[PDB]
Amino acid sequence: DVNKVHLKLEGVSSPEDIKLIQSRLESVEGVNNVECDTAGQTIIVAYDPDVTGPRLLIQCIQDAAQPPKYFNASLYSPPKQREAERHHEIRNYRNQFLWSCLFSVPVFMFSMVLPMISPFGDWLFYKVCNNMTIGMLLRWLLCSPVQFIIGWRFYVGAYHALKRGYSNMDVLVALGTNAAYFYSVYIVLKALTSESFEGQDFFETSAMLISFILLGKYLEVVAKGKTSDALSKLTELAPETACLLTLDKDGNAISETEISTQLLQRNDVIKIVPGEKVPVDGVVIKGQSHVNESMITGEARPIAKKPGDKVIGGTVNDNGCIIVKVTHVGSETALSQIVQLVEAAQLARAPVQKLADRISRFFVPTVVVAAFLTWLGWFVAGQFDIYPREWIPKAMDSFELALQFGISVLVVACPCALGLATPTAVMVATGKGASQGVLIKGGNALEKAHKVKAIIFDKTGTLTVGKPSVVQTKVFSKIPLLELCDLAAGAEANSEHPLSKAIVEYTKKLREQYGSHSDHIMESKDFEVHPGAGVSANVEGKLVLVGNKRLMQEFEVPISSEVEGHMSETEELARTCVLVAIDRTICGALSVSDPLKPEAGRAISYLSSMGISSIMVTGDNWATAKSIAKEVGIGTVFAEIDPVGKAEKIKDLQMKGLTVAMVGDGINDSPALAAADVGLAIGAGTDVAIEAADIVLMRSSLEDVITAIDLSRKTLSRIRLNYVWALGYNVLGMPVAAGVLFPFTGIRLPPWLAGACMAASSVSVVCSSLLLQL
Ligand code: ALF
Ligand SMILES: [Mg+2]
C-alpha cells in the first residue's frame, strides 16, 4: 500500500476517466512513480513506504467521480475464486470422466456382451469387405475419440515425463492404452486384407482404461480436501475501520472521522471505543483500561494498560477509552506477522510423493523387459522350431505370434485400478472418523499423521479447559461452607469477572452438594471493591470481603498458613489457585483453578506408550505450566512463548527428524498449527484455529488426538493393501498373457477372461470402516 498501493478503479470503463485520474495524480507530488496500466482499468501508485498515505490520493481519485458511476479505487482480490475453482475443477474432472464413459461404456456394451447376444450379435458379426466385421469398424470409430481426444492428458503426461523423470503413471497408461489400440488397429486392418484371419480387437481395454484412470483423477480431486484453509480470517480479526482523533491537544481539536484502518498510517491517533477491536498496535497516550489480549499470550486475563505502554492490534479492551499514537502499520503489525508466518508455512507444505509414481517408476521398466523377453521367447522358438507349427493361428507368421504374445503382456500388465488406491478410500477416515469426532481437512493430513512421533500441546484451552474453576476448595469465613459461597456469590452479583463466573460455578456445585439452590442472594450492597483487593460488598447487611491481603487488612484479617497453602505449586501458598478467594475470615481457602484435564492424563500416557513423545509450548506463566505438566506427565515445559516461538519449536523438532503435530485452540497456535506436518485444532477454540489446522477436533477431547493417529495408521495399513490388491491381479496375469500356460494347456490369451482383470482389480479395492479403541 504505502509502498505500492494498487488502485483497481471501480465504476470506470472508459480511458478518459483513467486519464483524468492520471492527470490529477501527476498534479500531486510525493509519488515516486506511477505505473500506468491503462489496459486493465487499474492504476499503480508507487511511492516511499512509511510516509503520508492513501488518503489524499484516494480523495484525488474520488474527485473525478461523474456519471454513470462513482469512481472508487482499491486493490480487488478474488473473494471466493477458491470455492468456485474447487467446484469447477471437481465438475471438470467429473465431466471428463462422464464423457469418457459415454464413449467407453458404448465400446464395452458392444464387444463384451452384445456380440454374445442376438440379434445384435448377428449385426455386429455381419461382415464387411473380407473379414473386417462392422463391429470392428464401429468400435474403432467409437474408441478413437476417447484415446485421441480425452487421452491428450495421458500423452502429454508421458511426453513430459520423457527423460526428466523415469516413469510416472502417465507413461504406464500410455503404454497400456496405445499398445492395445494399435494392436487392435493392426488386427482390424489385417482382417480386412486377409481371408481367414480371425481374432478379437483389444479396443475394449484401451477405452475402458481411460475411464478408470480418469475416475482416479476425479477421486484424487474430491479426496484432496476441503477448499484449502482461508487465511483471511486472520485479517478479519483486525477491524476494517476506526475513528481518527485530532482532538483536545493543542492543534488536535475535533476530528472524529471514520477512516478505514488500512488508510491509517504512522504517527496517527485513534479513539478506541470501550469494548471494540483495537485497530492496530500502538502506544497509548492517556487512559486506563484492561485489554483482553489473546494474540500473544492467548490467555484471557485482562492485562493492564497505563499511559505509556504498547497495545497490540487485533485486541479488545473493556475498561473505557484508550488514546493511542499509532506504532508499526500494515505489514509490521502482530496480525501481519501471523499472516506471513501462516502463509509461508502453508505455501511450503510440499505434496507427498504418491506411491503410484514410485510403483510406476519401476513397474513400467518391468513390463517392457517382460514383453521384450516374451517376444525374445516365441520368436526364437520359431527360428529353431521348438514349438509345433500348428500352434500358430491362421494367416500368421512366427513374428506375428510373438507379437500377439508380446503385446498381450503390455495390455494385461497395465494395473488399471492403480489411481483408485489412495483416493478410492475417499479417505473413509473422512467419514467414520467424523463419527468418531475427527474431521480431516484433506488427505495429506491422514497421510502424514501416521508417522507422528512427537506432538506439541497448548496449555490453555487444549490441555486445560481454559475457563477458571474453583475446584480444590476448603472452608474459611466464620459462616457455613454453603453460607460461605452464598455470601460470596451475593458479592458477585454486580461483579462480572472470570473469577466471578468461577465462584458462581463452584457455588452451584456446592448447592448441588448442599441439596439444591434453596432461596437466592441480593445485590452487591456497598460495592466496596478495591484495586487488586478483590470483591467486597455489604450483601444482606454483611460487609463481605472476597479478595486478597489488601482487602483482608482493609478490615484487618490476619494473614496465616492458608495464604501459605493454596497457590505457588497450585495449592502451596496464597489462598486460591494463584489468587484471592478467602471471603471474610480464614479457616482455609479455595482454588480458582483452570479445570485440569478430564482425560488428558490418560491421553498423554497412551501417547507416550505408542512411542509418541509430548511437548508443552504454552504462553502463560512458568509457574502455572510447571504444575500442569508435572501432574499430566509432559516432559519439556518451554513456556512464555510467542506465536513465532511456537512455530520455531515445531520447526526445530522437525529438523531433528521427527514428524511433529501441533494441537492448539487459539490464534496463537495458528503459525504453529500450519507449520506442523499435521495440525490439530480443538473445536472449542478460535475459528481461525479451526481454519488453519489440517484436523479439527469436534468433540473437545485430547483423546481424539490418539484416535486421529490410530485412524492415520490404520489407513496406511490398507493403503499398502489396495496397492497389493491393485498390482497383484495384473502381475499374476502377466504369465498368462505371455503364454506360459499355452505349452502346458493349449489355452491362448482370452480376450475377456484376462482383459477384464480391472473389474477384479477395482472391485478388490474395498475399504473397511471399523475403528476406535479409546
Ligand atoms: F492456550 Al496457550 F499457550 F496455553 F495458547
Ligand atoms: Mg489455547
PDB file of C-alpha atoms and ligand atoms in Angstrom, residues 297-298 458-461 617-620 646 665 668-669, ligand 1:
ATOM      1  CA  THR A 297      -0.414 -14.676  25.433  1.00  0.00           C
ATOM      2  CA  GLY A 298      -3.533 -16.470  24.227  1.00  0.00           C
ATOM      3  CA  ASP A 458      -1.099 -25.704  24.130  1.00  0.00           C
ATOM      4  CA  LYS A 459      -1.969 -25.467  27.682  1.00  0.00           C
ATOM      5  CA  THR A 460      -4.795 -23.141  27.945  1.00  0.00           C
ATOM      6  CA  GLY A 461      -7.788 -24.448  26.015  1.00  0.00           C
ATOM      7  CA  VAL A 617       4.764 -24.985  24.430  1.00  0.00           C
ATOM      8  CA  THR A 618       2.421 -22.544  26.156  1.00  0.00           C
ATOM      9  CA  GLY A 619       2.471 -18.772  26.505  1.00  0.00           C
ATOM     10  CA  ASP A 620       1.354 -18.451  30.116  1.00  0.00           C
ATOM     11  CA  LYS A 646       5.701 -21.722  18.927  1.00  0.00           C
ATOM     12  CA  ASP A 665      -7.026 -23.861  20.204  1.00  0.00           C
ATOM     13  CA  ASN A 668      -1.510 -18.161  18.896  1.00  0.00           C
ATOM     14  CA  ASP A 669      -1.385 -21.744  17.648  1.00  0.00           C
TER      15      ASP A 669
HETATM   16  F1  ALF B   1      -3.732 -21.845  25.067  1.00  0.00           F
HETATM   17 AL1  ALF B   1      -1.988 -21.482  25.135  1.00  0.00          AL
HETATM   18  F2  ALF B   1      -0.247 -21.109  25.208  1.00  0.00           F
HETATM   19  F3  ALF B   1      -1.844 -22.460  26.618  1.00  0.00           F
HETATM   20  F4  ALF B   1      -2.132 -20.511  23.647  1.00  0.00           F
END
